[PDB]
Design an enzyme around this catalytic site. Sequence first.
Site, PDB file in Angstrom:
ATOM      1  N   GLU A  34     -18.376  11.287  26.357  1.00  0.00           N
ATOM      2  CA  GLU A  34     -19.648  10.577  26.423  1.00  0.00           C
ATOM      3  C   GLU A  34     -20.515  11.163  27.541  1.00  0.00           C
ATOM      4  O   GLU A  34     -20.137  11.136  28.714  1.00  0.00           O
ATOM      5  CB  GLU A  34     -19.431   9.080  26.681  1.00  0.00           C
ATOM      6  CG  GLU A  34     -18.340   8.445  25.827  1.00  0.00           C
ATOM      7  CD  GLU A  34     -18.300   6.933  25.957  1.00  0.00           C
ATOM      8  OE1 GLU A  34     -19.147   6.264  25.337  1.00  0.00           O
ATOM      9  OE2 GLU A  34     -17.434   6.414  26.696  1.00  0.00           O
ATOM     10  N   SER A  61     -15.472   5.218  34.623  1.00  0.00           N
ATOM     11  CA  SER A  61     -15.504   4.314  33.478  1.00  0.00           C
ATOM     12  C   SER A  61     -16.272   3.034  33.801  1.00  0.00           C
ATOM     13  O   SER A  61     -17.124   2.601  33.025  1.00  0.00           O
ATOM     14  CB  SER A  61     -14.084   3.936  33.042  1.00  0.00           C
ATOM     15  OG  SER A  61     -13.357   5.059  32.587  1.00  0.00           O
ATOM     16  N   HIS A 119     -17.927  11.319  30.672  1.00  0.00           N
ATOM     17  CA  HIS A 119     -16.766  10.468  30.504  1.00  0.00           C
ATOM     18  C   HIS A 119     -15.818  10.961  29.413  1.00  0.00           C
ATOM     19  O   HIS A 119     -16.197  11.043  28.241  1.00  0.00           O
ATOM     20  CB  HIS A 119     -17.281   9.046  30.226  1.00  0.00           C
ATOM     21  CG  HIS A 119     -16.218   7.993  30.204  1.00  0.00           C
ATOM     22  ND1 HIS A 119     -15.481   7.699  29.078  1.00  0.00           N
ATOM     23  CD2 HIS A 119     -15.768   7.165  31.175  1.00  0.00           C
ATOM     24  CE1 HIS A 119     -14.623   6.732  29.355  1.00  0.00           C
ATOM     25  NE2 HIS A 119     -14.777   6.391  30.623  1.00  0.00           N
ATOM     26  N   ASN A 128     -15.750   1.807  25.703  1.00  0.00           N
ATOM     27  CA  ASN A 128     -15.238   0.646  26.418  1.00  0.00           C
ATOM     28  C   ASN A 128     -16.099  -0.599  26.238  1.00  0.00           C
ATOM     29  O   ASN A 128     -15.568  -1.713  26.144  1.00  0.00           O
ATOM     30  CB  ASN A 128     -15.059   0.944  27.913  1.00  0.00           C
ATOM     31  CG  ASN A 128     -13.951   1.942  28.176  1.00  0.00           C
ATOM     32  OD1 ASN A 128     -12.858   1.828  27.622  1.00  0.00           O
ATOM     33  ND2 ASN A 128     -14.219   2.915  29.037  1.00  0.00           N
TER      34      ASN A 128
END
Lengths: 291, 293
Positions: A159, A126, A147, A197
């Site tokens: 992702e 991440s 991800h 994020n």
Amino acid sequence: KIIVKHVTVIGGGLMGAGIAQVAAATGHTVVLVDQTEDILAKSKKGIEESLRKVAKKKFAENPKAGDEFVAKTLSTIATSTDAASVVHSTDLVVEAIVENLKVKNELFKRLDKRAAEHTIFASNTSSLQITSIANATTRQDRFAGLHFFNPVPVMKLVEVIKTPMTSQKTFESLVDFSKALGKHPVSCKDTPGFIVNRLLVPYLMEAIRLYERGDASKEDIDTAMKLGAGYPMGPFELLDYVGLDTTKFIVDGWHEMDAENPLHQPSPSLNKLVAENKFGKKTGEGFYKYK
Amino acid sequence: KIIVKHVTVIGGGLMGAGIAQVAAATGHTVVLVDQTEDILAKSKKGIEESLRKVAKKKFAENPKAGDEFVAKTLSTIATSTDAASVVHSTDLVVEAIVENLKVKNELFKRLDKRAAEHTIFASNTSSLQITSIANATTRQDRFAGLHFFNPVPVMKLVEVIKTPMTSQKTFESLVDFSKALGKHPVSCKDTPGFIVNRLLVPYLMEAIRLYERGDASKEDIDTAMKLGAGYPMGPFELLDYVGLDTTKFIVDGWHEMDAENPLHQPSPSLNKLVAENKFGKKTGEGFYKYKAA
Ligand SMILES: NC(=O)c1ccc[n+]([C@@H]2O[C@H](COP(=O)([O-])OP(=O)(O)OC[C@H]3O[C@@H](n4cnc5c(N)ncnc54)[C@H](O)[C@@H]3O)[C@@H](O)[C@H]2O)c1
Ligand SMILES: NC(=O)c1ccc[n+]([C@@H]2O[C@H](COP(=O)([O-])OP(=O)(O)OC[C@H]3O[C@@H](n4cnc5c(N)ncnc54)[C@H](O)[C@@H]3O)[C@@H](O)[C@H]2O)c1
């Protein structure tokens, strides 16, 4: 085309275990790797329990099938404590170990030498530059980011992080694999935070700064975003849910990478809670106290 | 205490008409105010069309009942072109007119002379300092912000904004009124963006910057935030839904007050669309194109 079928998942934690489970559930052969036999035994045990919880629901009208389904999916997941010995002919290596760049790089630098030619390397990291790990190998064209989101077996988004060196062949392979997992892949460059994020965390930090500023209570802010923006959880409820320590780590990273940007400025309140080991739900207490 | 029973709503636009609708539906006596009898006729007509649409769905098992519901709610909504003619006997004035400081101040400066002594003045403004408007009067203790969300009849949240001078009595009165409307009030200080827009808008801008920066497509970003964050609408669909001009307006203001803050830097893509009169679903085209109904 390289059709991913044999997958090697390194790390039997929250994410790794979920990845292994969804791959096996969707017909892929899986080898889950971790540091000890105990960690592995526990990891596979949780996978079974999760599979059974679901089966007991979709197979109420036929308990037999339910158990066959669980046994089948669970039988297509193997375990090992030596990644080097499993990657010889694996199609894809998905890494989900401790969030530490040094450890990750050594891992892949080592694996790069055992893995087959066609094998694709992918990290579920991440808060780490995919390129900063792809350069630890000479397989940059087959290195990418993949991800996922917790709970992996439920969350449909993935992702696919392509670096400047990632080939198109490698990209499409991962996009197809994602769809094979029953996921909906989106594309993003190897930038910090990727998509989710990058747009979520900074917002959560802003929610905290509004509170520290004394402009509104945590409760009202949470209510505001749920009723006003239609969000599933208010920023503080979500901060606790995802882990305060986890959040702090990501933000501190972006802060050390650009200590100027006001969006990554440390939060006194966030640090204090992390200090006194209050990580959120997983610790029974974060911004709010649980159970 | 003094319970709000009579409400004067100034502005028959999107927000104002909705505010009047919800107040009248919940038993409050309402006076909708706007500049012309035509504008007012158009607004009240829009309120009726909205009530009847809600009626057909709620009273499908008895159209007669639904007609009484609509008629009853619609009857408690008078209309006047000059608010000063009715505020001497109103309990609350909720202003929702053009987003311009000078105009609002001139409005409240004059109403201040008519409104009964107990009357509370409230502004639904999104991009102005409540305080700036309140000081146009000598009634600051009975002045506050009451910020709603579109479509007012549906959105349950309402932000009750307290300036340093707003009294406790005024605040509680507005909180009760908020609950009386069937809404859920939250408290915030008179700061830019209050709560929702302060946390929402800057996020929408980052979405645009991520896109202009070419890190991801608009389509993937929307998909990512809907599936990964559980949001009802992706950032670009929401931008088009709330208004690109409405958005650019709010950000320019913040940018103007603190020009060095990166969070308010102008968006080339946003400005270009706005300049081309592409406001979103309002004009059939924003970041995406829509079916001009
Ligand atoms: N923690 C989150 O909330 C979250 C969410 C999304 C993605 N991630 C990503 O997932 C990865 C792991 O996160 P997690 O939450 O699953 O962690 P975790 O701590 O639950 O599990 C990691 C597992 O890796 C094993 N491990 C550590 N070093 C290893 C090595 N050298 N070789 C083999 N196994 C090793 C551990 O023993 C542990 O069982 C990270 O790359 C992180 O960026 C985390
Ligand atoms: N647009 C949104 O989504 C939104 C959300 C929350 C709050 N607001 C706030 O609501 C207010 C109005 O927004 P809107 O979208 O309802 O507007 P609108 O353009 O739909 O309607 C404004 C109405 O004000 C009337 N008006 C203008 N000057 C007047 C005056 N001097 N006296 C009496 N009436 C006058 C107009 O004739 C018009 O009918 C603003 O303060 C705005 O910041 C807007």
